[PDB]
């Protein structure tokens, strides 16, 4: 009913990702030495908040929330979540020698971010903000979503789809949970390629581009052929048509992984020598 | 030594004074005069430092100037082969804090007219030595206006020509804040190219001038998407009060042409009688200095 001061609980130990998520920590529980992720936040209720966002984390997909706390003084608010070790996909891609992950690999870590996003989704939850920096990797090579569901700037847009960029004929410019679908594919572009397309422009542009462009296509015709199939799926330019969560994850790229078992182990050996 | 075509290590020349926590800005010191500077320290990769040195070449000159806080220069502190280094973005330190906090700090978060006279004057200057040296600031508001212990006023430069602080670093893809945009820099419908024209940056000037009269930019009261959509398209914004005089209004109206091509000089706008016509000026000043002097208390 009413939330403590932090001191004793946890502790700051550093910033992340150095400036990436702006006042975001690795934490530490003070009793315990787990590690967890520490936002900041000066405040001025929150209790209905957390306990939301405590209710949706709780699926291997999504990291986990642990509480909040409030430091007082502009008072300071702690939201508190399960630590994720091994960096970003983002991250493993930049440190993968050219730039590119195995078709398996993009097959598997696609595949736990849609059932992530399948469980949001159920609850009508909309993530918004898909892309490489909010996809995380334990050292067991699980795959976990952050950031989903103040707000005075405008972040990075080579993930956002067509229908959340207002336009004239689109003035009041929807997020629908289909949007996370695109964001999916462009992260799997990226996982790909080492970056998003569009990446080559300046990013005002690049937010003029995509409601007008054609859906991005990988670069290489190296792929398979269900690759390919996948990205067209999730890049479905016009929303309506676009296929829902549970679709994708029937999708053949997405459904049928046989390699399983050693995708988790390369991943993980991949992790420890990447470190 | 300060060099402004190099990219070196600050071993040497400039020091951190604070602890670094996190392109966050800590104060710091020239190692051989001790003079204080405000130092922006950004992680970046070794392509960014590639990418440095080619925006280096296109640094365009300007001497110091009494309205801008002067740009020392960029420098490198190196980390190992497995690690990020740092790029140093130096410039003189200003210690009474920005536009902004003056606001805010002030009862009802409104200046006085002849204030917003005086700061927008100052302003106008430094731009104007910006402008005839062909550079662009590319992001006046009130956060990027400084004020010296002496009640100076002086526009944020960290490398303004070469954009530095903004191209690099992992937030260089960011759109960023949109409220003190000019139209011409928003890609729409009708804008397929985003302009960047030094007019740009009086149309800013104007948003700031708001900013000081109300607390806040036009559009606040909007998410920035929304906000970034309804600029290119709303007429020009104006002051909510019909407290404030003629001349203000006509200001106001000045900076905010909704084309720029239409849109006066900074030569022009220096001409304008709400700056021009300044008969408070000295003690416009001294309340300044005042209201400093009493906040640092
Ligand atoms: C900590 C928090 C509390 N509410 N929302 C969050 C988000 C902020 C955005 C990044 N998110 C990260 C970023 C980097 C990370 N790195 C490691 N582990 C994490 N959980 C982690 N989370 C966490
Ligand atoms: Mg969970």
Redesign the interface.
């Known amino acids: 009913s009413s939330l403590r001061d932090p001191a004793g609980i946890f502790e700051l130990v550093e910033?992340v990702?150095?400036?990436?998520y702006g006042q975001v920590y690795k934490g530490r529980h003070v009793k315990t030495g787990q590690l967890a992720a520490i936002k900041v936040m000066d405040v001025t209720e929150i209790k209905l908040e957390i306990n939301m966002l405590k209710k949706y984390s709780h699926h291997r997909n999504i990291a986990t929330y642990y509480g909040a706390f409030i430091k007082k003084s502009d008072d300071q608010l702690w939201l508190v979540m399960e630590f994720c070790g091994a960096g970003s996909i983002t991250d493993l891609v930049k440190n993968t020698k050219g730039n590119t992950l195995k078709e398996d690999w993009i097959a598997y870590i696609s595949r736990e971010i849609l059932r992530g996003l399948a469980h949001l989704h159920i609850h009508h939850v909309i993530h918004r903000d898909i892309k490489g920096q909010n996809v995380l990797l334990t050292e067991n090579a699980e795959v976990k979503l952050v950031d989903f569901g103040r707000?005075?700037?405008?972040?990075?847009?080579?993930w956002m789809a067509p229908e959340v960029?207002?336009?004239?004929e689109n003035?009041d410019?929807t997020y629908d949970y289909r949007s996370d679908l695109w964001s999916c594919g462009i992260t799997a572009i990226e996982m790909a390629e080492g970056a998003p397309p569009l990446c080559d422009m300046?990013?005002?542009?690049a937010?003029?581009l995509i409601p007008r462009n054609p859906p991005p296509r990988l670069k290489s015709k190296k792929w398979s052929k269900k690759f390919f199939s996948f990205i067209e799926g999730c890049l479905v330019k016009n929303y309506m048509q676009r296929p829902s969560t549970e679709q994708l994850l029937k999708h053949p790229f997405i459904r049928d992984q046989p390699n399983e078992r050693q995708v988790r182990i390369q991943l993980k050996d991949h992790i420890d020598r990447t470190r």
Request: charged share 10%; glycine share 12%.
């Open positions: 910033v990702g150095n400036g990436t707000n005075t700037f405008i972040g990075t847009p080579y960029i207002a336009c004239d003035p410019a300046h990013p005002m542009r937010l003029f």
